[PDB]
């Protein structure tokens, strides 16, 4: 997994190589600016030191002295007239050089990652459909955003700072060795340790922003799986249990957070302990080297400052090589996708294009297996012919040969043996595209793309006129209801717009198939999922669509298949028998068995929120001042050591004053290491118990909130797991971090302003003019070096919608072959923020260049007027060092501090969300404890006139006056048409909502006065596709009854009546077998039996069976019906019914339509009624 460096630079034209060449040279001559800045600082401090020693020698020089000493400063006043020119030359050079290095690398990266991103979406959309099912689609989408964003970060900007920092290294040691080699080697003895501390500090500085959620990822997985499965976790109880389990995963993430923050502040503590120890070593040794008359103070500042910025420039270059290595590892599988290759190329123009095709269609001896598992054989020796205009319907045992025929006719896969022909010509010698345009597909579940109706007709064929769209919609029997919706064709559909029903989406999918005008029509289970009222109009539209077209239909419930020309039956991938309906009736084969089976801060509130661990805060405040105290203290002792070398004292008192100041550097180092070791410990631990307690309170709060709150489109699962995870770690910064900021800065700058005004006030006013822009330089440089000021990832979230849409709906976007239109839309949505990023690449280059240039110009302007003050004797040089080091270096420190800490806008909007959510009071309070709670177990249920509206769409009504009685032990099944409200009765009887009017009675008593946990304790729900949790078998079945000790033995009884015990007894690791993505994948029937067992552990007196069409399993269909029949024998049971075999034996069945019950009676009595029951039973009679 490693691209070579030259193979990575494959998408650069002739221009971008010139950009990175000129930006490389600009990196080289930008990196060498700062060490020669330390050179010029060395010469000027030799100017001031020599003139200060000469004038301070002869102050005993009366008579006349008014022009002697003033002339002794006429030395130093015309000499800095040219060092002001050197400083403004380095500044005016580093302005354009710093400009051209940063903007050129960002621009080369913008063009490269524009082409890599666009062509990577090309090469994903040009990939075969068998490769699609091997590789998980969500991970491929996350690869599309993440992996290209990673090669973006590695390719452009970090490897400009790499050459900058390495040129700073080699230039720093070249001028270090050419000024003085002795002290260069003395620092070079300890420079591995300095370089290592610098490297670890830079690496924890860079990010520092992304690797913070790995400890949380386990508990975040727990919270995600329970919020994804809300309607079974607030349904079975276990709010307390899953709350305990998330708490238990949460405390470990708290512990790893503690270890993270304490190791981060150890790693900063060794950094400042080593710069303030190397200050002591090099001013100690440089002192005992300039006291011998061997160096000068300008050499010691030059060679020491430049060598030490060199050693720290290494570690400044440390994370860039690893970001390049991560970029190269990402580019191995991006480049490995975009190189090569499909065998069936949907873009090529190679094969023939025969016109006026009639559709004589042939399968000959085809043998095929899916590429995910070669070992099972799906189709063996299959032979078919269907000639033009004829209709073949293919039926048999499900899962074998039905849908693979329609997936081979589109040439989605190549068969291993045999040949498939169209019109006598082999399909693998014709072009793939022209193949896919002459065939129209109608899938089982219809998909709509998030744009207008007419824009979905554009995807069918792009050059269609609006009149032809109107005729195609009229032919698809969709015109009258589409004229009735509020906006018009321009109505927005998708996940953002209004939600159409399944038959509606399906017949406009028919309208796409009709606008393509195909000669061959393929229908794969077009009406298995649809109810009895919409299937008539859909079957009318499909019977209109079949006129004049060769048709292949794969479908269950073969009611109208009789009219089709020939029926073909499958067994083991082989069609055993073929003919018209009546021949398959006389044969008494598979088909006759199927027909007889058929028939706002408020900031003080956040400190009040964190008003439990006040002792931490108190020690934190007392420790933060000590940080702010030691930043001017460095400028004080620094200007006292260079202030003791610009006077003329005794050699022994200069030796012992400099030993005092060197030791005091080391004391500053120790009392720095302790003070933000434990400052990081106390604000880190107070903020992390704040975020653990705040996560636990917000999650306990969210498990209480009703189903009404989860239906809110502002409250999908990504918004709540992302909101919880982000807005609990932010609010740590809203209180705990800001007091460290304000007290560090107020001691830092406050003390610097005060001591600087005491020692000389004019120069402090001048530097006070400079003090905003150089602190801006601190914050802008720290936002540059953290990687924060370049990435935003909120301008590409308008272009990730279409990419995500095209990856997830890839079967449809292949079967109508609109890879090209999606490449176009993604290309333009990529090109607008491309243009913006091209403009921003100049603005950030000029603000970084400009404000660095303000630092260099700031040296110039400070020391010129400093020379003028010193010249008229109304200051000294240690005072321009004290007020310059205090105001300026304090300004850099308040920039670095005020940027290294977290934000404050995101922190306060986060705390507005958290304290806006944790004090929310639910309507139907679940964690309450009042209620009647009787010991009755009869359970005669009675709905009386229930009126309900779903709160996500309160305009449309669903239930109006629904009344029905359910006696003890009997069975009521409920059926009806679409939009009736039949799925709502489970949610109303379980009291997810209360009705507006009417009443719900359990056992003569209104539910609204009973306790909700007891009510849900005596109800056993069995959902349609059962949700299984990520744990073993015994917990998933034992999850049924909580607040109980449940015995292991008790699991076995429920598994017996759920008919899995005999099947489990052959499974590996019978009862502690883990289930999920890693363990065995069970079929939908076996999982359905597991949900039956989970409902059977409770032994409830009411059983709610929520089951739906259709079951293709044919090996567990009968055992799930056996387990359901064993469960319903002596229990009051309400079933939402779609299988017609369960309803004959029910004691009563209820047909609901538009919230109204039409009629009642037994099955055969309502059959003799000759109404809706007899109509629904009469549909499958065909």
């Amino acid at each position, epitope marked *: 997994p490693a691209v070579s460096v030259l193979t990575m630079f494959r998408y650069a034209g002739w221009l971008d190589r010139l950009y990175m060449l000129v930006g490389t040279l600009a990196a080289i001559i930008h990196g060498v600016a700062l060490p020669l800045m330390m050179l010029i600082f060395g010469e000027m401090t*030799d100017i001031f030191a*020599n*003139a200060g*020693n*000469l004038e301070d*020698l*002869m102050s*005993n*020089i009366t008579n006349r002295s008014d022009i002697n000493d003033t002339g*002794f400063f006429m*030395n130093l006043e015309e000499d800095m007239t040219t060092y002001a020119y050197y400083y403004t030359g380095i500044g005016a050079g580093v302005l354009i050089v710093a400009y051209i290095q940063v903007s050129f690398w960002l621009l080369a990266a913008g063009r490269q990652i524009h082409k890599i991103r666009q062509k990577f979406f090309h090469a994903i959309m040009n990939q075969e459909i068998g490769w699609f099912d091997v590789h998980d689609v969500g991970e491929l989408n996350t690869r599309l955003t993440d992996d290209v964003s990673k090669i973006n970060e590695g390719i452009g900007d970090k490897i400009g700072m790499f050459f900058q920092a390495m040129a700073t290294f080699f230039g720093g040691f070249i001028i270090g060795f050419t000024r003085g080699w002795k002290l260069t080697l003395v620092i070079l003895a300890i420079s591995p340790v300095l370089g290592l501390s610098a490297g670890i500090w830079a690496k924890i500085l860079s990010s520092f922003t992304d690797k913070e959620l790995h400890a949380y990822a386990k508990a975040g997985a727990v919270a995600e799986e329970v919020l994804a499965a809300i309607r079974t976790v607030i349904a079975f109880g276990g709010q307390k249990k899953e709350l305990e389990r998330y708490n238990n995963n949460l405390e470990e993430a708290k512990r790893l957070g503690i270890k993270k923050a304490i190791t981060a502040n150890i790693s900063m503590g060794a950094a400042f302990l080593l710069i303030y120890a190397s200050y002591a070593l090099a001013f100690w040794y440089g002192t005992t080297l*300039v*006291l011998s*008359g*061997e*160096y*000068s*103070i300008g050499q010691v500042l030059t060679v020491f400052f430049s060598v030490l910025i060199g050693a720290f420039s290494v570690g400044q270059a440390s994370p860039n090589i690893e970001a390049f290595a991560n970029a190269r590892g990402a580019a191995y599988e991006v480049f490995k996708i975009i190189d090569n290759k499909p065998s069936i190329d949907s873009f090529s123009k190679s094969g023939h294009k025969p016109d006026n095709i009639q559709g004589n269609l042939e399968f000959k001896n085809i043998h095929f297996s899916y590429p995910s598992r070669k070992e099972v054989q799906i189709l063996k020796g299959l032979n078919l012919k269907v000639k033009s205009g004829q209709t073949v319907a293919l039926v048999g045992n499900s899962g074998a040969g039905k849908s693979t025929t329609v997936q081979l006719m589109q040439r989605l896969y190549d068969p291993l043996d045999g040949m498939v022909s169209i019109d006598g010509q082999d399909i693998r010698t014709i072009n793939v595209r022209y193949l896919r345009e002459i065939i129209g597909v109608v899938s089982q579940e219809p998909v709509l793309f998030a744009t207008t109706i007419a824009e979905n007709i554009r995807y069918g064929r792009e050059d269609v006129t609006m009149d032809e769209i109107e005729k195609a919609v009229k032919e698809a029997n969709a015109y009258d209801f589409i004229m009735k919706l509020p906006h018009q064709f321009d109505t927005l559909v998708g996940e953002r717009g209004a939600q159409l029903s399944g038959g509606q989406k399906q017949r406009i999918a028919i309208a796409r198939a009709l606008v393509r005008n195909p000669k061959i029509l393929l229908l794969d289970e077009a009406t298995c999922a649809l109810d009895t009222e919409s299937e008539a109009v859909v079957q009318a539209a499909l019977d209109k669509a079949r006129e004049g077209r060769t048709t292949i239909v794969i479908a269950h419930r073969l009611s109208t298949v009789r009219n089709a020309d020939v029926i073909a039956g499958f067994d083991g991938g082989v069609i055993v028998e073929q003919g018209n309906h009546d021949e398959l009736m006389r044969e008494k084969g598979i088909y006759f068995k199927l027909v007889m089976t058929q028939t706002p801060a408020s900031f003080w509130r956040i400190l009040k929120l964190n008003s439990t661990e006040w002792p931490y805060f108190v020690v934190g405040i007392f420790v933060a001042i000590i940080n702010g105290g030691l930043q001017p203290a460095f400028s004080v002792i620094f200007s006292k050591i260079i202030g003791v*070398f610009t006077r*003329i*004292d*005794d*050699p022994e*008192t*200069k030796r012992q004053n400099s030993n005092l100041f060197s030791l005091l550097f080391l004391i500053l180092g120790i009392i720095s290491f302790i003070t933000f070791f434990l400052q990081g410990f106390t604000f880190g631990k107070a903020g992390e118990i704040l975020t653990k307690r705040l996560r636990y309170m917000v999650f306990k709060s969210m498990l209480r909130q009703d189903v009404s709150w989860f239906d809110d489109p502002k409250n999908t699962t990504g918004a709540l797991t992302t909101r919880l995870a982000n807005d609990a770690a932010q609010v740590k910064g809203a209180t705990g971090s800001r007091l460290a900021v304000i007290f560090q800065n107020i001691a830092n700058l406050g003390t610097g302003i005060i001591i600087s005004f005491i020692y000389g006030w004019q120069l402090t006013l001048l530097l006070l003019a400079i003090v905003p822009i150089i602190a801006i330089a601190g914050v802008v440089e720290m936002k540059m070096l953290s990687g924060q000021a370049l990435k935003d990832k909120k301008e590409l979230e308008g272009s990730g919608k279409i990419a995500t849409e095209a990856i997830e709906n890839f079967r449809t976007v292949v079967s109508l072959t609109r890879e090209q239109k999606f490449e176009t839309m993604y290309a333009q949505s990529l090109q607008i923020p491309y243009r913006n990023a091209m403009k921003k690449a100049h603005v950030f280059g000029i603000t970084f260049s400009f404000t660095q240039a303000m630092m260099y110009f700031s040296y110039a302007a400070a020391f010129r007027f400093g020379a003028y003050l010193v010249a008229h004797k109304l200051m000294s040089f240690e005072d321009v060092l004290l007020v310059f080091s205090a105001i300026v270096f304090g300004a850099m420190a308040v920039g670095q501090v005020s940027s290294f800490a977290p934000d404050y806008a995101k922190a306060t909007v986060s705390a507005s969300h958290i304290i806006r959510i944790i004090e929310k009071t639910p309507e139907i309070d679940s964690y309450s404890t009042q209620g009647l709670k009787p010991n009755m177990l009869e359970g005669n249920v009675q709905f009386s006139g229930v009126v309900f509206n779903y709160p996500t769409r309160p305009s449309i009504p669903v239930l109006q006056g629904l009344s029905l009685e359910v006696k003890k032990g009997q069975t009521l099944a409920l059926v009806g048409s679409s939009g009736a409200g039949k799925s709502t009765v489970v949610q109303l009887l379980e009291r997810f909502y209360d009705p507006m009017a009417g009443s719900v009675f359990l056992d003569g008593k209104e539910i609204k006065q009973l306790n909700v946990q007891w009510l849900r304790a005596q109800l056993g729900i069995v959902s349609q596709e059962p949700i299984l949790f990520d744990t073993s078998i015994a917990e998933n079945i034992a999850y049924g009854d909580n607040s109980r000790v449940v015995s292991y033995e008790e699991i076995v009884r429920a598994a017996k009546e759920a008919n899995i015990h005999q099947f489990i007894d052959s499974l590996p690791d019978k009862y502690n077998t883990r289930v999920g993505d890693k363990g065995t994948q069970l079929s939908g029937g076996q999982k359905q039996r597991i949900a039956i067992a989970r409902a059977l552990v409770r032994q409830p007196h009411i059983l709610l069976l929520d089951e739906a069409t259709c079951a293709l399993d044919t090996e567990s269909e009968k055992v799930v019906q056996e387990a359901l029949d064993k469960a319903r024998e002596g229990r009051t049971t309400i079933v939402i019914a779609h299988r017609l075999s369960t309803i004959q034996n029910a004691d009563l069945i209820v047909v609901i339509q538009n919230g109204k019950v039409k009629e009642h009676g037994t099955h055969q009595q309502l059959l003799a009624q000759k109404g809706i029951y007899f109509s629904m039973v009469s549909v499958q009679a065909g």
Partner: antibody
Amino acid sequence: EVQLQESGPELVKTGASVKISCKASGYSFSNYYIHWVKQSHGKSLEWIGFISCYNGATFYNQKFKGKATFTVDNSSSTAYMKFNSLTFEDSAVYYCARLPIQFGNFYPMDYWGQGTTVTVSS
Amino acid sequence: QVVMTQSPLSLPVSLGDQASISCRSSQSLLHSNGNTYLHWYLQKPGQSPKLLIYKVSNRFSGVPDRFSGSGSGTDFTLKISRVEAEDLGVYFCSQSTHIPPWTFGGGTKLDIKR
């Protein structure tokens, strides 16, 4: 090894100038003041003046002001004085001493040239 | 301009014993720091003058233990303890602690005591 060697004896006629040199070798030349001191025959060591030797910032004694002029040469690391408008009272032995600039007045003139005798005649 | 009266004028030392040379200033050589700055130099004829003692009691890097000085205020003394035949030159006492003249002492030869 620290050595200040000086030029050879001079025999200059009255009135013309003479330029006398103190070549330094073995140390960091750019620090020490170079003091020029005068010794007559059998008298105390008179003090002529000094140079800052970093930038040539002179300071003359009040007696030897104008009729002595100091200068340096950084590249060859030498000091010089042109001692113009001679008289008979300027035939003497001239020395050069080095003083550390970092602490002058508080430290002895520790290394010395061997002395160049200037004999002024007519 | 403190005028130093270095009192010896010529000093007849014999060989292998101690002889003291006196330097008497005409102003108190006691600076504001509690340090007395006068310095003692050796000078042989033809060669350069060597620094010998500094700040009346200290000693310079490379000179043997025969040379030690004492005294304070305006009375100063260097001690030629156990004289060899190698140190026979003219000795003189720098400096004025009050600059700028850097007033030197006159001089003191040595001898053999025939």
